Amino acid sequence: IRKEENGNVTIITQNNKQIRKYSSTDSATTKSNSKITVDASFVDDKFSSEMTTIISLKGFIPSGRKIFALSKYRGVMRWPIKYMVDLKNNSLDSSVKIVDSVPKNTISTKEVNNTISYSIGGGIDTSNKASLNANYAVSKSISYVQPDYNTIQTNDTNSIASWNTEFAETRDGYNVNSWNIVYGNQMFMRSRYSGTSTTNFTPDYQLSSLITGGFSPNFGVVLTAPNGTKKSQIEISLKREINSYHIAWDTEWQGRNYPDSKIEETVKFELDWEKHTIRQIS
Ligand SMILES: [Zn+2]
Ligand SMILES: [Zn+2]
Ligand SMILES: [Zn+2]
């Protein structure tokens, strides 16, 4: 397959048949300083019965971690047990559809690599693997990291694709279910007999970057639309759940994780299928 560049246009030729790809990028910042970036690739394929747009979602959700002493004998580490991302298609009434998305099902690897491949005619192939060793007319790579976390697709329909990236288990084998009758839950406990109430949490170099910094998701969807479609809408929601991991000293440190708070923010984007643009609206 031959491809050639012309700014935001890629002319793709495969066996006498030619298609075009138009790129559009928009960025938005939320009230709580979460970041969302959408890369839309509008495909123009006269040999396909409909219009196809591939959307790459890249974001940053701050961990919101805080460490403070309740007293000399009780310390608290607030941390993001769960990150949630929704891409909602608001135009199913106009028969605009999400026809595929990645990641699929559940992914547990520290590094996530997905691939969205388009074939002339409309065909779509989605892989939870990396590529790009195949001769697809258009392939889009998706990649992010999630040390100590897992990602599950909780919704996968024409109307919505949803992902939960939730804490799984520490390297030492502790999770939110761990309970030792003496030391309680020790998932983020640096030691059982040392440190102060704000000094005895797992050092930063031994915590997931999702806890020390934040989550940098990269997810993907594919939308289709009837040939004449001018505009459609999507909504992207970023959600973070914070928990409070308490350590309390009796004659040793005892650990316990409590629920705390949830923050959800939503950004709206309009797709102009004629001008090949994606713009935040509202
Ligand atoms: Zn077009
Ligand atoms: Zn699927
Ligand atoms: Zn605008």
Author numbering: 9 to 290
Quoted passage from the original study:
Clostridium perfringens Delta toxin is one of the three hemolysin-like proteins produced by C. perfringens type C and possibly type B strains. Delta toxin itself is cytotoxic to the wide range of human and animal macrophages and platelets that present GM2 ganglioside on their membranes. It has sequence similarity with Staphylococcus aureus β-pore forming toxins and is expected to heptamerize and form pores in the lipid bilayer of host cell membranes. Subsequently, they oligomerize on the cell surface to form prepores that insert amphipathic hairpins into the lipid bilayer to form an oligomeric β-barrel pore.
Here, we present the monomeric structure of Delta toxin at 2.4 Å resolution, determined by X-ray crystallography. It includes a monomer of Delta toxin, comprising 282 residues (residues Ile9 to Ser290), 139 water molecules, three glycerol molecules, one imidazole and three zinc molecules. C. perfringens Delta toxin structure has an elongated ellipsoid shape composed of eighteen β-strands and three short helical fragments: two 310 helices and one α-helix. These secondary structure elements are arranged into three structural domains: a β-sandwich domain, a stem domain and a rim domain. In Delta toxin, the N-terminal residues form a β-hairpin that extends halfway along the β-sandwich domain and creates a cap above the folded, monomeric stem domain residues. Finally, Delta toxin has a four-residue deletion in the residue 177–183 loop relative to the S. aureus proteins. This deletion means that Delta toxin does not possess a Tryptophan (residue 177 in LukF) that is important for phosphatidylcholine binding in the S. aureus proteins. There are three glycerol molecules bound to the hydrophobic region of the rim domain. Interestingly, when Delta toxin and LukF are superposed, the glycerol of Delta toxin is positioned where the glycerol moiety of the phosphatidylcholine would be expected to be in the LukF structure, if it had been ordered. One of the glycerol molecules in the Delta toxin structure is interacting with the Arg200 residue, and, it is likely that, in analogy with these related proteins, Arg200 in Delta toxin is important for cell surface recognition.
